[PDB]
Amino acid sequence: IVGGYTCGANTVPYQVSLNSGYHFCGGSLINSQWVVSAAHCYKSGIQVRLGEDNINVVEGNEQFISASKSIVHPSYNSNTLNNDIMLIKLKSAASLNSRVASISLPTSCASAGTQCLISGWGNTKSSGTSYPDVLKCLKAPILSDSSCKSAYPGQITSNMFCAGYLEGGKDSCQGDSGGPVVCSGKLQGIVSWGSGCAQKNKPGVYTKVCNYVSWIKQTIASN
Ligand SMILES: [Ca+2]
Secondary structure (H helix, E strand, C coil): CECCEECCCCCCCCEEEEECCCEEEEEEEEECCEEEECHHHCCCCCEEEECCCCCCCCCCCCEEEEEEEEEECCCCECCCCECCCEEEEECCCCCCCCCCCCCECCCCCCCCCCEEEEEECCCCCCCCCCCCCCCEEEEEEECCHHHHHHHCCCCCCCCEEEECCCCCCCECCCCCCCCEEEECCEEEEEEEECCCCCECCECEEEEEHHHHHHHHHHHHHCC
16 A cells, blocks of 8 residues: 555454465455455465454464465456456354454445545555555545546456546555455455556556455355
């Protein structure tokens, strides 16, 4: 997160870190046994780390649970990043309390104008590299489909939306990928892609979760 603020410990209780020896991606806890993340985050050997604030210190609210199964979206295309979404089942159920909690799925899509909370342990510099230890947060609006498409001609599908600021300076970044975009208490987006970070006229591009709720629910029901 570039141009954000320190969230505060365990204030984003659905935020997870994906670990394969180091933090490499975010995700969101959507029930006690399932995590939603970006398909471009897929790899084997994932450990899900819940209840984190400082990813480099054991602080006392962590739960570390191995993935038992990963499911990339059937239609994921790694070249276009269309359908950049994946489900991870945990080997055991997480224990849910105030500091570790699931996030609601949307029953309807969000619209342009709605403010959202984006969070992660990704890079904090736009023209630089500095990775935080503690979770960072940014409040940002959804942008119109037209300004999204004008920012990225020929690249925005119906499964993507833009959020952030056209002026630059505030955005998600490398290492935030897979993490949440939550609007009025609903998981509306997944950190997916963008040209650089926090650059002028190059807002964040997010997976449009509302398009996937049917796939998410049926997948959970059968696995
Ligand atoms: Ca920790």
